[PDB]
Amino acid sequence: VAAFLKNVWAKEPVLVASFAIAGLAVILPTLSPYTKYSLMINRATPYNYPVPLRDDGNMPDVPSHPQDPQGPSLEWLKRL
Amino acid sequence: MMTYIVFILSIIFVMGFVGFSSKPSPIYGGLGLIVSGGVGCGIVLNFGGSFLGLMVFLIYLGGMMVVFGYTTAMATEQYPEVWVSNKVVLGTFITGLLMEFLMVYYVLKDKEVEIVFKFNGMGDWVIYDTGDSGFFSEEAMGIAALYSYGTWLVIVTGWSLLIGVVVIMEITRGN
Amino acid sequence: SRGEYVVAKLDDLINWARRSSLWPMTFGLACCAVEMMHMAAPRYDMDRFGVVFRASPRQSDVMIVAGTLTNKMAPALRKVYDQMPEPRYVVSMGSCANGGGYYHYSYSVVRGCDRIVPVDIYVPGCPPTAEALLYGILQLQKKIKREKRLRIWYRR
Amino acid sequence: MFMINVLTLIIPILLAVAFLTLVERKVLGYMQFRKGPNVVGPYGLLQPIADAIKLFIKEPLRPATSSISMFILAPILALTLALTMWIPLPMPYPLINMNLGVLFMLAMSSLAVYSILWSGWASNSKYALIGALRAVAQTISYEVTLAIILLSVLLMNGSFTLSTLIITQEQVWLIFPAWPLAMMWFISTLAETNRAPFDLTEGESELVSGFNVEYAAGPFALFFMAEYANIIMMNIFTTTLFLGAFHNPYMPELYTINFTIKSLLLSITFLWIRASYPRFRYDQLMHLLWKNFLPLTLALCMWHVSLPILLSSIPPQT
Amino acid sequence: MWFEVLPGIAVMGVCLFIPGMATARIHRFSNGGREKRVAHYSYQWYLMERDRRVSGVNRYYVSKGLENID
Amino acid sequence: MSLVYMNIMMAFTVSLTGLLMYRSHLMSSLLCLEGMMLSLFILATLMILNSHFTLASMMPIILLVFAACEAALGLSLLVMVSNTYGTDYVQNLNLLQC
Amino acid sequence: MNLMITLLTNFTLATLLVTIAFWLPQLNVYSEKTSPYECGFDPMGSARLPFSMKFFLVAITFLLFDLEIALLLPLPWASQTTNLNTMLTMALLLIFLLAVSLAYEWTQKGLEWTE
Amino acid sequence: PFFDVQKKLGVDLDHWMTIQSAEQPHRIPARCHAFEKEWIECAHGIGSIRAEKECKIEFEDFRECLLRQKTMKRLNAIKRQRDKLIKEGKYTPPPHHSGQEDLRP
Amino acid sequence: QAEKDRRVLQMLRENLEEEATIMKDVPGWKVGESVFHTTRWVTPMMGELYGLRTGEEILSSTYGFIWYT
Ligand SMILES: CCCCCCCCCCCCCCCCCC(=O)OC[C@H](COP(=O)([O-])OCC[N+](C)(C)C)OC(=O)CCCCCCCCCCCCCCCCC
Ligand SMILES: CCCCCCCCCCCCCCCCCC(=O)OC[C@H](COP(=O)(O)OCCN)OC(=O)CCCCCCCCCCCCCCCCC
Ligand SMILES: CCCCCCCCCCCCCCCCCC(=O)OC[C@H](COP(=O)(O)OCCN)OC(=O)CCCCCCCCCCCCCCCCC
Ligand SMILES: CCCCCCCCCCCCCCCCCC(=O)OC[C@H](COP(=O)(O)OCCN)OC(=O)CCCCCCCCCCCCCCCCC
Ligand SMILES: CCCCCCCCCCCCCCCCCC(=O)OC[C@H](COP(=O)(O)OCCN)OC(=O)CCCCCCCCCCCCCCCCC
Ligand code: SF4
């Protein structure tokens, strides 16, 4: 397949460059480990108001104040 | 009378529709459709859909330009009719404008009309919403949700466009 | 009177604008067109004086008859001169466009372009050199400068 | 007060168009081993004034076989569209701060073709028809590749707003990560305005003058200033897209000087290209964008839509 | 020589320097010495309308500070 | 309803009666088809933007796409016609009467 | 409010430059100057004859392609959604279908001009 | 025939754009979300024949929310009466309805 | 949010109190009658608030954002 690649690179280099760019753009996001970073960056952006919940009495995971240590923090985004 | 701006733009819209639907000649029909597309994009831009108006304006300008190339190429006459070169075309244009302005005068008198549905006479500014929309426009997020949600719509539209390209190749072959 | 001074200054302004923006037409027939292109050469540089060739007669100021005006060509030259907008000037250059030149007694040669179109400046030579043609262009500019259109309009 | 702003926008661009005619003639002369106009005034500063006064005192010459209404409407539409499409450009603050200025400029660049088309069709001549159909061929050659280039280069900006393009290029220029798109955009802007080597409408070789061959002085000047204002606006648009300058909110004059000299260099590059290349055939231009530019544009669009997801570098939309 | 293309180009520079900065000067004149506020999204327009209502002069650029409160 | 709804529906009916009475020219009928498509697009986006139905904003633009899925097709059904006859008149399309 | 003011200002400034160009100078109209220009000779036929085009197939392809890439224009805003893998897959599929259609046009000699 | 493939395979294809009360992007609500929700919850599983006469109040309220016909009629009547009283000179507009009104913030 | 709530309640009360003064001699009219059969609060429509005000406030409110440059 080296002869075919050399012939098509000598004849039409534009199509070879386009196909190489397309192949990298297709097979590269499945290899990089930074796609989940984009996922939680997009999910961490506050478009809507964080509507509070009524305190029934047993909710240990949610805080009572935003400065409380419980809750989803973004020190990873500040670090990156 | 600035509160009826969308109503005035819609009047120009139906005026352009009467202008090109009388079919004088496809050049001036294309000009009338360009004017109608411009005032229609103005209307939908006044309702807040600026992206949709700009998109339909661009798409119809490109389509009308390809159409004009076709009529210059293929659908032409020795003496094209502008609007008054034919009695029937000028006549139907005159009655279309007359019917439009008669409807305008009737709806501008008692602020109510019955053509098959029932319509009011106040400006459309009443039906707007009073609240804000945050840090996003609703139409932009709605069309941006085509890829995150509408996978089936994207699939069938892409297949329809590819099949359309193949169909255009197959029809204009000759053998 | 102040109106006479006003129309004189306006006539001077429009004559300056018309004489400093001459737009000839790309129209040659023979040898004298080669000498005209040598006037358009970098040495003589007609575009210094605002002289720039224009292909269409509708956006042209003057027409330079450079070559031999034959019998088969005269209606075309007349129509081309007719299509030019007013004010229009014609510069006749070369002996062929002046009086027939070498071919005065020929059967199919118009004896001068004066018989077909009105002529402002006659440039003699065979060919008249690029220096001579530039001199004729400057003489045409001088003739345009001493025009008296608005003064005569005020007098009339 | 807005009247003052719009008149101070539209008068200096007309003066810039006239002095662009002067600079074009003089620079094109100097690249051809000769001199430009220098006899009208001191170093030829009064040549555009002489040309403008000369063209507006000549006969209009409306033809008899031409539909007069479209014949008058077409240059008016050309000059109008050349005027009300300079507005969304940030200099550094645009006169009209549109949220979708990029699509606005795309739509009004698509609309300006109709002036050429109706000028060719209205004046009943065969050369005008040939020029109009060549304009149609040029539009269908360039438009889709131009739009995909803009879409691929706006994936790093975040939105279609032209005002936020300065903030995007605050750190580095946008020509460093998108230089193939920059080259293809430059060729697209060359082919958009019917500038050399893609003139093809005012062709003085294949035709006499093309679509404006029946337009005498007065209406003919309108197409000239529309074309020259168009090339200046393309130069400013390319400068904003790919060569974003440093902006200080306390001193806008720094940004004004910077993009002014950059757009001047881009116009000088336009005239540099004009004097050095033979004219393309209008079927070779059709196979240029549709076969060489388009596949690379599609590949670069996929690359630029899969790149910020790959790198956690999706730009904000606010 | 070549530098004689530099005068006319310089005039072009002035012809490209006048409009845009003038807009900035206009934006520094109407808005009371500050930039003209942008409203790309409806929240910014709501803040603009609130400022215009709270100024009391029907001008949104008349900024009322913390001395207004008790 | 409102007023602009009445005007857009009137425009649709005007383009409909423009389409249904041919004037011996196929391009004029194609222009009428494009006009009815534009009127339907404008009415749909007016209703959608009024009612804040954001997820249906995918509807009109996608709808606009299928416009070409007939409209350009109509042009491809013309060139063979213009290769069969020198013009594009609709009175030449009467061979299928027997 | 400002956009129509700018539109009206530019339209007025454009339309004033022809009525100045018309009513100002001295006009002299005869029935030889305003004839159609065909390089000195009167033309054969009219300019309203059918001008047989060659690039009709590429014109229809542009008709499809303009809106089929206009579907790709909300791709900036589509980068702001929470679901990103599906968006990336659908966008890549759309441009892949575009490339397949272009390659099918190229291979079947569809981009070449007739005659 | 309506071969309901979607519920058979559990694959969602076009059920999200069917109504305005579905999962909208960024939880953007429609202007008549409550009325449509009430009408759907009223007429769920009881059949169209029963729903045409048993849940007509909610559907009528939803249709009033969609097109605002009765609100336009009431506003037109109020505006007409106000203009008639102005024309007779029997009514003067209040200062807060004429521009000098001093709104809350 | 609190300021907007108090503002729209003030505007609705102001429009309600001047509706009775405008319409007192008409027969069969009921002041403050709803058009919805339910008693649930609905979002006020732009015609319900600015129905009895001058046109400058109309153009500032329902067209101010779109027309702003
Ligand atoms: C805005 C910034 C400045 C921009 C440049 C402006 C100044 C320079 C201007 C020069 C003069 C231009 C005059 C007009 C020219 C018109 C003709 C023209 O442009 O033709 C285009 C020509 C067309 O070719 P053609 O016309 O010769 O056609 C050849 C046809 N065959 C093969 C059949 C014989 O070239 C292109 O289309 C190239 C476009 C740009 C390519 C950029 C590639 C970047 C690198 C990609 C990756 C490569 C590595 C491999 C993959 C690696 C992956 C990791
Ligand atoms: C007979 C031949 C023709 C003769 C007449 C020719 C007239 C001039 C033709 C050329 C110009 C056509 C213009 C068409 C509409 C363009 C709309 C536009 O430019 O919109 C830009 C901008 C959109 O930005 P947006 O996101 O809405 O921002 C709001 C948040 N700040 O919008 C805004 O920011 C909103 C500003 C106010 C908008 C008001 C509503 C639209 C007004 C349309 C006027 C009429 C257009 C007629 C076009 C005819 C074309 C042939
Ligand atoms: C009551 C009082 C007022 C009455 C009304 C009149 C108002 C003023 C009207 C315009 C000026 C009138 C005078 C015009 C020039 C007259 C003198 C003249 O002809 O000078 C010739 C001289 C060049 O001499 P030349 O023969 O070329 O020399 C050979 C070179 N080796 O030429 C030169 O050196 C250059 C001449 C330049 C003339 C002025 C500049 C042009 C006009 C500018 C203003 C008008 C246009 C404004 C812009 C319009 C849009 C572009
Ligand atoms: C954004 C920037 C745009 C800039 C645009 C303008 C660029 C160029 C600026 C001017 C440069 C110098 C021009 C000099 C022109 C020639 C002047 C001259 O010598 O005129 C002489 C002529 C005849 O006079 P004569 O009676 O023969 O003299 C006797 C001598 N022993 O007498 C006459 O012709 C009469 C007097 C004419 C005077 C003309 C002066 C120049 C006018 C230029 C027009 C634009 C002015 C600036 C506009 C914007 C700023 C306000
Ligand atoms: C899976 C990868 C991504 C695929 C989808 C995305 C594609 C993005 C680019 C879109 C390109 C659209 C246009 C493609 C047209 C291909 C068909 C064609 O026209 O072939 C003709 C050409 C020979 O030229 P000729 O026949 O003379 O053409 C007539 C006028 N020139 O024929 C040729 O030159 C040969 C063309 C085929 C062979 C190309 C080989 C490229 C190799 C690149 C490096 C390896 C990449 C590995 C990925 C898989 C590639 C298959
Ligand atoms: S005058 Fe002499 S040089 Fe000129 S065209 Fe005649 S023969 Fe040739």
Coordinates of N, CA, C and O and ligand atoms in Angstrom, one line a residue, chain A residues 9 11-14 17 20-21 24, chain D residues 175 179-180 182-184 186-187 190 197-198 238 269 273 277 280 288 292-293 296, ligand 1:
Chain A
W9 N 0.0 10.7 -3.2 CA 0.6 11.8 -2.7 C 1.3 12.7 -3.8 O 1.4 13.9 -3.7
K11 N 0.1 12.7 -7.0 CA -0.9 13.2 -7.9 C -1.8 14.2 -7.3 O -1.8 15.4 -7.7
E12 N -2.4 13.9 -6.2 CA -3.4 14.8 -5.5 C -3.1 14.9 -4.0 O -3.6 14.1 -3.2
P13 N -2.2 15.8 -3.6 CA -1.9 15.9 -2.2 C -3.0 16.5 -1.3 O -3.0 16.2 -0.1
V14 N -3.9 17.2 -2.0 CA -5.0 17.9 -1.2 C -5.9 16.8 -0.6 O -6.3 16.9 0.6
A17 N -4.1 15.1 2.3 CA -4.1 15.9 3.5 C -5.5 15.9 4.1 O -5.7 15.9 5.4
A20 N -6.2 12.6 5.8 CA -5.4 12.4 7.1 C -6.0 13.3 8.2 O -6.1 12.8 9.3
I21 N -6.4 14.5 7.9 CA -7.0 15.4 8.9 C -8.3 14.8 9.4 O -8.6 14.8 10.6
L24 N -7.5 11.7 11.7 CA -7.1 12.2 13.0 C -8.3 12.7 13.8 O -8.5 12.4 15.0
Chain D
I175 N -4.4 33.7 13.6 CA -3.8 33.1 12.4 C -2.8 32.0 12.8 O -2.6 31.2 11.9
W179 N -4.1 29.0 10.3 CA -3.6 29.5 9.1 C -4.0 28.9 7.7 O -4.1 29.6 6.7
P180 N -4.3 27.6 7.6 CA -4.9 27.1 6.4 C -6.3 27.7 6.1 O -6.6 28.1 5.0
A182 N -7.0 30.6 7.2 CA -6.7 32.0 6.9 C -6.4 32.2 5.4 O -6.8 33.1 4.7
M183 N -5.6 31.3 4.8 CA -5.2 31.3 3.4 C -6.5 31.1 2.5 O -6.7 31.8 1.6
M184 N -7.3 30.1 2.9 CA -8.5 29.9 2.1 C -9.5 31.0 2.2 O -10.2 31.3 1.3
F186 N -8.6 34.2 2.7 CA -8.0 35.2 1.8 C -8.4 35.0 0.4 O -8.8 36.0 -0.3
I187 N -8.2 33.8 -0.1 CA -8.6 33.5 -1.5 C -10.1 33.7 -1.7 O -10.6 34.2 -2.7
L190 N -10.8 37.3 -2.0 CA -10.4 37.8 -3.3 C -11.4 37.4 -4.4 O -11.7 38.3 -5.2
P197 N -7.0 37.8 -9.1 CA -7.1 37.2 -10.4 C -8.5 36.6 -10.7 O -8.6 35.8 -11.6
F198 N -9.5 36.9 -9.9 CA -10.8 36.4 -10.1 C -11.8 37.5 -10.5 O -12.9 37.6 -9.9
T238 N -11.2 40.6 7.6 CA -10.1 39.7 7.7 C -9.1 40.1 8.9 O -8.7 39.2 9.6
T269 N -1.6 44.4 0.1 CA -1.4 43.0 -0.3 C -2.4 42.7 -1.4 O -2.1 41.9 -2.4
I273 N -1.3 41.5 -5.1 CA -1.8 40.3 -5.8 C -2.3 40.7 -7.2 O -2.1 40.0 -8.2
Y277 N -0.7 38.6 -11.3 CA -1.2 37.3 -11.7 C -2.1 37.4 -12.9 O -2.9 38.4 -13.1
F280 N -7.9 34.2 -14.0 CA -8.4 32.8 -14.0 C -9.6 32.7 -15.0 O -10.3 33.7 -15.3
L288 N -11.9 25.2 -8.8 CA -10.9 25.5 -7.8 C -11.5 25.3 -6.4 O -10.9 24.6 -5.6
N292 N -10.7 21.6 -4.6 CA -9.5 21.7 -3.8 C -9.8 22.3 -2.5 O -9.3 21.8 -1.4
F293 N -10.6 23.4 -2.4 CA -10.8 24.1 -1.2 C -11.9 23.4 -0.3 O -11.7 23.3 0.9
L296 N -10.8 20.1 1.9 CA -9.9 20.6 3.0 C -10.7 21.4 4.0 O -10.5 21.3 5.2
Ligands
LIG1 C1 -4.8 36.0 5.7 C2 -3.3 35.7 5.8 C3 -2.6 35.7 4.5 C4 -3.0 34.6 3.5 C5 -2.2 34.6 2.2 C6 -2.2 35.9 1.4 C7 -0.9 36.3 0.7 C8 -0.5 35.2 -0.3 C9 -1.3 35.2 -1.6 C10 -0.7 34.4 -2.7 C11 -1.3 34.6 -4.1 C12 -2.7 34.0 -4.3 C13 -3.3 34.3 -5.6 C14 -4.5 33.5 -6.0 C15 -4.2 32.0 -6.1 C16 -5.4 31.2 -6.6 C17 -5.1 29.7 -6.8 C18 -5.1 28.9 -5.5 O1 -5.1 29.4 -4.4 O2 -5.1 27.6 -5.7 C19 -5.2 26.8 -4.5 C20 -4.5 25.4 -4.8 C21 -5.4 24.5 -5.6 O3 -4.5 23.6 -6.3 P1 -4.5 23.6 -7.9 O4 -5.3 24.7 -8.4 O5 -3.1 23.5 -8.3 O6 -5.2 22.2 -8.3 C22 -4.4 21.0 -8.4 C23 -5.3 20.1 -9.2 N1 -4.7 18.7 -9.6 C24 -4.1 18.1 -8.4 C25 -5.8 17.8 -10.1 C26 -3.7 18.9 -10.6 O7 -4.1 24.8 -3.5 C27 -5.0 24.6 -2.5 O8 -6.2 24.4 -2.7 C28 -4.3 24.6 -1.2 C29 -5.1 25.4 -0.1 C30 -4.3 25.6 1.1 C31 -3.7 24.3 1.7 C32 -3.1 24.5 3.1 C33 -2.6 23.2 3.7 C34 -2.1 23.3 5.1 C35 -1.4 22.1 5.6 C36 -2.3 20.9 5.8 C37 -1.6 19.6 6.3 C38 -0.5 19.1 5.4 C39 0.4 17.9 5.9 C40 -0.2 16.6 5.8 C41 -1.2 16.1 6.9 C42 -0.6 16.1 8.2 C43 -1.6 15.7 9.3 C44 -0.9 15.8 10.7

